[PDB]
């Protein structure tokens, strides 16, 4: 299989290793109490929390969001330039990409009296700000995780986001391409898919996310309906839960994943 190296980033169970829709793949203790917390190794592009907004500071002392309360010095929210300046003496941190840097910055804040509880974070590409999430919960349905037009520039980050996610994690959608399974020198179609109707790529990506690996009933370890072949002509989102191992050239298709950005194509 000549697709091995290229298709490696789409082995989400391996490269992400946790829930996508709801990421709670690890447990950490704070002062003798066990808490669940995100642990996915890949960034989730376009993911936010809908409250029936969540980047607002959490209520201290209940009309607030999930983000960190004001501090001195204010470390959340913090711009990319603010973070790089804050770690200007740390060569192991100052040159990290914006997503990994946001993750390491969030994981720097220990609320314990040397535990391993590290807050999840959200990087907003719009104004280039890193928001440390004080609330690691993602669904209580009251709130729910979702991909939305309002969330297209958000990026949900766990503590385990790898510094080379650009190389090993999905981001772009593959235009004129179709996920398949490599069998005997040929790339065959996914034998069984679950067809959901979708107006565009965004809606297809939203559906895949909704059906994707979840560590909470509405640990997955990355298992789930994480992939989708979107036929832009028949407007069908073909969703499946087995990892693809090759690509089929088809101008009618766009290959998307739950981790992938809802809009960007390549």
């Amino acid at each position: 299989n000549p697709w091995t190296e290229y298709m490696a980033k789409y082995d989400i169970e391996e490269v992400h290793g946790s829930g996508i829709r709801v990421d709670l793949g690890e447990d950490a203790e704070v002062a003798g109490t066990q808490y669940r917390l995100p642990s996915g190794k890949c960034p989730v592009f376009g993911k936010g929390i809908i409250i029936e907004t969540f980047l607002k500071p959490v209520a201290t002392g209940k009309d607030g969001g999930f983000a960190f309360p004001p501090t001195n010095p204010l470390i959340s929210p913090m711009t990319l330039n603010g973070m790089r300046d804050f770690y200007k003496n740390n060569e192991y941190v100052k040159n990290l990409d914006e997503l990994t840097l946001c993750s390491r910055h969030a994981g720097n804040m220990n609320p314990d009296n040397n535990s391993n509880y590290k807050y999840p974070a959200v990087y907003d590409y719009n104004d280039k700000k890193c928001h440390i999430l004080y609330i690691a919960a993602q669904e209580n349905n009251c709130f729910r995780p979702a991909k939305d037009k309002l969330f297209e520039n958000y990026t949900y980050l766990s503590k385990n986001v790898v510094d080379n996610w650009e190389e090993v994690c999905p981001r772009k959608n593959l235009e004129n391409a179709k996920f398949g399974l490599w069998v005997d020198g040929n790339c065959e179609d996914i034998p069984h898919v679950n067809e959901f109707s979708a107006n565009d790529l965004f809606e297809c990506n939203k559906l895949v996310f909704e059906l994707s690996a979840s560590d909470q009933p509405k640990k997955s370890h990355g298992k789930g309906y994480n992939w989708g072949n979107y036929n832009r002509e028949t407007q069908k989102c073909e969703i499946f839960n087995v990892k693809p191992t090759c690509l089929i050239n088809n101008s009618s298709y766009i290959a998307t994943t739950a981790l992938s950005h809802p809009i960007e194509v390549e």
């Binding site: 501090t71 001195n72 010095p73 470390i75 770690y87 740390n90 941190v93 994981g107 720097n108 804040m109 220990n110 609320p111 040397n114």
Partner: peptide
């Protein structure tokens, strides 16, 4: 309220 894990360790209230 928090203490930075990475050196130098400073306490942000």
């Amino acid at each position: 309220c928090w203490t930075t894990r990475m050196s130098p360790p400073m306490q942000i209230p």
